[PDB]
Amino acid sequence: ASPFRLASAGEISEVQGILRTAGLLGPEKRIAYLGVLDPARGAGAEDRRFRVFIHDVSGARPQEVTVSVTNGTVISAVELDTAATGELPVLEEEFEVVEQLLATDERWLKALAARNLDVSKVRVAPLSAGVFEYAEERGRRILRGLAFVQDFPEDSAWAHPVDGLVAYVDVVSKEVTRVIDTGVFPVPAEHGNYTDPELTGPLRTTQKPISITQPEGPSFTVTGGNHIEWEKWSLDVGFDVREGVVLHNIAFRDGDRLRPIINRASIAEMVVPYGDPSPIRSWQNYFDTGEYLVGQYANSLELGCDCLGDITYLSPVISDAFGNPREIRNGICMHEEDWGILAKHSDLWSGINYTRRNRRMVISFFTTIGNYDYGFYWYLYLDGTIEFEAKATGVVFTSAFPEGGSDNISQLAPGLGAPFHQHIFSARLDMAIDGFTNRVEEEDVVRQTMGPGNERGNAFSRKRTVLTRESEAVREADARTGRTWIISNPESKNRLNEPVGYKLHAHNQPTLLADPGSSIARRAAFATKDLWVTRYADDERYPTGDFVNQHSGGAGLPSYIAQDRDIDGQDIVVWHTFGLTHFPRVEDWPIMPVDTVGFKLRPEGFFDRSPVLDVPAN
């Protein structure tokens, strides 16, 4: 029975039972985070452990707690000084509180009355507060509110932002701390109702069906709930409330032996920094993963439209605020799809014409964080390639469009603006290239001068620089010189006596644009550089640390690498920053078509020849 299996409803209840029995889950206690821990290095006696962050609604300090569900014990339980180490993740029950409190606040009511807005119609987005100049906030759970008018129950409030107005609220003490009204801006009037026949026009009747079926079922097998076997690949599909879909034990069956490639793959953080210097939004940065927990808002995916073809679903189970299990029904899609030509050659000399088709295994989920929706897709290809893709859609976050324009906002509709922002991901790749003794090299293309040894000036080459210690493993992209990073195992050689390896190909999109002195440059330090390599430690899980909410700099990647540990042939972890810089366009409105970003890794001398020679003709 696999120690990487998904959490069951029964294990969550049992964690609830253990915490209760131990006096840790009283009626004022709320579970802000609950996840199964990964087995320790060299673990394979089953010991299923769970980590829990417990919040207290009476204002008592929260606790970080580690439970062992196999033995029914509490391993550890420590009280957190949230002013030092960070507030716990935002709770779903707090979302509604910001609006609720504000409705009876004289300063808010006065703001709304000045704009002739009915309070019953004003929705309020509960946004993370971050850390800025407000000393009273240190140690308190604050959310900031931005207002959107909803004309009727099924109206898109995003069409009607209320600019010039923002409020700060304490969700534990249930007080409004501040209401800032910098002045009235017109509230945009056009609606953004993309199911309304008057905006859509008559729907298209021209789309004929595309049917994708597998009459013998899929080529992959699921065993033990979440262990996948597919075209030589094997892995375990995990799910965590914070990270979402996590991949464990990525390995490839090369002949007789199962060869490990990646021990653990996840999206360990994502940040959405806004680039509008208005005080109404200049504080706005979302850590969807770290502050909000993208996994808990995973959608239930419907058949025939979210995932198309012969789909196998997992329904991962998470804890609600009280420790009861709730299943995200059909939260994870798994299927295989055709991927065009894999390899082809029509040889004149031999007379042999050869064509083989490609395919990929797809493991995905989709999450919704207020106006934003994100699809997270992992792909495994026949040829050994591993890819991640993020798909960004939803409704763009809106503001007023100033009269006379803006260098930091674009116009979507009359008076309607969309502040510039980025969406930036950190992929945490706990490498295991033919096992754990790994090293990373930076590879650049090398141009050569015409002269002795190169008289026609056609030569070009490449170079590789080993990253030997964490202090020299914070790297930036260089698209111009074709920079990639190769993860190799210096003690496992292919038949040509070269170290086996995988090469990471980035998209070389811009990294974090904020000024390096900014609060966000410190809280999202990871996002300022494209590639980090650390020595593995079981407590270095996120590039932003364990508690991101209103937590200043001081944890996460920059503190991990300060240890300057040896990474030249050790158990190492690759953290790749990648993101989209979004200047919104009128085509993004009223609902945004998908835009994508990602990366991939391809074998680099890993195999002894092509690993797809045994793929049959179609």
Positions at the binding site for Cu cation: 421, 423, 582
582 binds, among Cu ion, Na ion, its own copies, none (CB under 5 to 8 A by kind): Cu ion
What are residue 325's DSSP bridge partners? 319
Region of 68-76, 104-112, 383-391, 569-577 interacting with its own copies (CB under 8 A): 383-391
Q: Is 163 a catalytic residue?
A: no
Region of 64-72, 180-188, 342-350, 433-441 interacting with its own copies (CB under 8 A): 342-350
Asked if residue 614 binds its own copies (CB under 8 A), the reply is yes
Region of 28-36, 109-117, 479-487, 558-566 interacting with its own copies (CB under 8 A): 479-487
Region of 75-83, 380-388, 426-434, 466-474 interacting with its own copies (CB under 8 A): 380-388
Which one of 299, 437, 492, 552 is in contact with its own copies (CB under 8 A)?
Answer: 299
CB of 189 to Cu ion, least distance (A): 24
Binding residues: 286-297, 369-374, 421, 423, 582
Nearest residue (beta carbon) to Cu ion: 582
Asked if residue 258 binds its own copies (CB under 8 A), the reply is no
Asked if residue 449 binds its own copies (CB under 8 A), the reply is yes
Which one of 73, 100, 173, 346 is in contact with its own copies (CB under 8 A)?
Answer: 346
Asked if residue 106 binds its own copies (CB under 8 A), the reply is no
Dihedral angle sign, alpha carbons of residues 132, 137, 139, 143: negative
d(CA 55, CA 75): 18
Judge contact between 365 and 331, C-beta under 8 A. Answer: yes
Which one of 582, 590, 604, 607 is in contact with Cu ion (CB under 5 A)?
Answer: 582
- Quick one: which of 536, 433, 443 has its CA closest to 493? 433
> Per the residue annotation, which of 274, 372, 381, 536 is the catalytic one?
372
93 vs 172, 265, 292, 508, CA distance in Å?
11, 30, 12, 39
- Quick one: which of 202, 167, 521, 235 has its CA closest to 379? 235
CB of 585 to Cu ion, least distance (A): 10
> In a 3-state reduction of DSSP, which class is residue 582?
strand
- In the region spanning residues 412 to 471, those forming contacts with Na ion, defined by CB under 5 A, are 430-431
Amino acid, res. 525: A
d(CA 485, CA 473): 11
d(CA 391, CA 389): 6
DSSP calls for 490-538: EEEE-TTS-EEEEEEEE-------S-TTSHHHHHTGGGGSSEEEEE--T
For the chain, the distance separating the N- and C-terminal CA atoms, rounded to the nearest angstrom, is: 37
CB of 61 to its own copies, least distance (A): 30
Rg (CA), the chain: 26
**Helix ranges restricted to H, 458-500:** none
> Per the residue annotation, which of 288, 430, 546, 588 is the catalytic one?
288
CB of 289 to Na ion, least distance (A): 21
Asked if residue 153 binds its own copies (CB under 8 A), the reply is yes
Q: Is 288 a catalytic residue?
A: yes
Asked if residue 30 binds Cu ion (CB under 5 A), the reply is no
Q: What are the residues binding Na ion (CB under 5 A)?
A: 430-431, 536, 571-572
Q: What are the residues binding Cu ion (CB under 5 A)?
A: 582
The residues carrying an active-site annotation are 288, 372
